[PDB]
């Protein structure tokens, strides 16, 4: 049903050149990968700052190619299966676009990923923007970012 | 406060490259333009024949830079002015980074426009999808798309 994700990338305007993927599904199910090909010399002192250094080791298995994390998901998002693919994400334009760029032109996405992400940002004001518990200190990993807003929709929607 | 809008453009995996945007405010006001920038023989087959044709004569004053309509757009969302700016889009994504990538990266938008666009697909969802107009027979024309998405968006919050 619901995967919960979040991206870092460096955006320059033009491109949006991703680094890494966190993919968390509501039955406990976790995907995460940092991209072998961006150019770690492009990013700004932001992403030099809060992004790089979180990254793991050069020799750790997270480190995959764009072609690699593309089957990766399409085998963890069960493309081929029954249930409904539903995306969401925190402020998640640029996320969903870095996401769909790992298959090209919009064109070529599997029929069954949804082509629009829902925006838990949205959802959250719309339900009267409850208090939510503080971001963790770890943030800027795209895995625990993506595990934070799985809790944050089941905090939001534990009335509905 | 919300506006509400629709982009064509060229897409190839890398870049989004803006053909037009249109844009309508809640209060009635309405923007459209066209880029003189974007290369028409770099379109795919789908946009040359459901997009370019739509697309005015090229001595309509319609047709604007990419710097002028950034700056109509600053002008025409009264990003000075006193109002929240709410941006709605149906499905739009690729329409909210192609907007922004009119000031260039997410570190050039000025401070009052908003970081995402609300997603009124995600809001008929959450209503339970209620019934609306059949299309327009001029669609993939960006205004239009934008007066529809506005039209949707009044039925569903009445
Ligand atoms: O203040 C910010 C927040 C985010 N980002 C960019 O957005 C991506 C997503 O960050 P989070 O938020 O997830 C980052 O990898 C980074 O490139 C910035 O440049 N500045
Ligand atoms: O079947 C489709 C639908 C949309 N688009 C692209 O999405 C843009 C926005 O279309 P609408 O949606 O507005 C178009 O300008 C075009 O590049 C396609 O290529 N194929
Ligand atoms: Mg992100
Ligand atoms: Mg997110
Ligand atoms: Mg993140
Ligand atoms: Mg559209
Ligand atoms: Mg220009
Ligand atoms: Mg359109």
């Known amino acids: 049903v619901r995967y919960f994700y979040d991206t870092e990338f460096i955006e320059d305007g033009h491109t949006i050149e991703l680094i890494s993927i966190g993919v968390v599904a509501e039955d406990g ?8 090909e961006f150019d770690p010399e492009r990013a700004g002192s932001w ?4 992004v790089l250094p979180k990254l793991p080791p050069p020799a750790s298995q997270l480190w995959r190619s764009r072609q690699q994390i593309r089957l990766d998901l399409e085998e ?4 081929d299966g029954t249930d409904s693919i539903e995306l969401w994400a925190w402020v998640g334009a640029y996320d969903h676009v ?5 298959w090209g032109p919009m064109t070529a996405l599997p029929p ?14 719309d339900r009267g923007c409850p208090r939510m518990p503080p971001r963790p ?4 990993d795209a895995l625990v970012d993506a595990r934070d807003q799985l809790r944050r929709f089941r905090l939001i929607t534990s009335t509905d």
């Open 76 to 79: 963890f998002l069960r493309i």
């Open 29 to 36: 199910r976790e995907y995460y990968a940092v991209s072998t």
């Open 47 to 50: 992403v030099r700052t809060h």
């Open 112 to 125: 069954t990923v949804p082509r629009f992400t829902r925006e838990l940002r949205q959802l959250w004001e």
């Open 98 to 102: 870095a996401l769909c760029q790992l």
């Open 137 to 140: 200190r770890d943030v800027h």
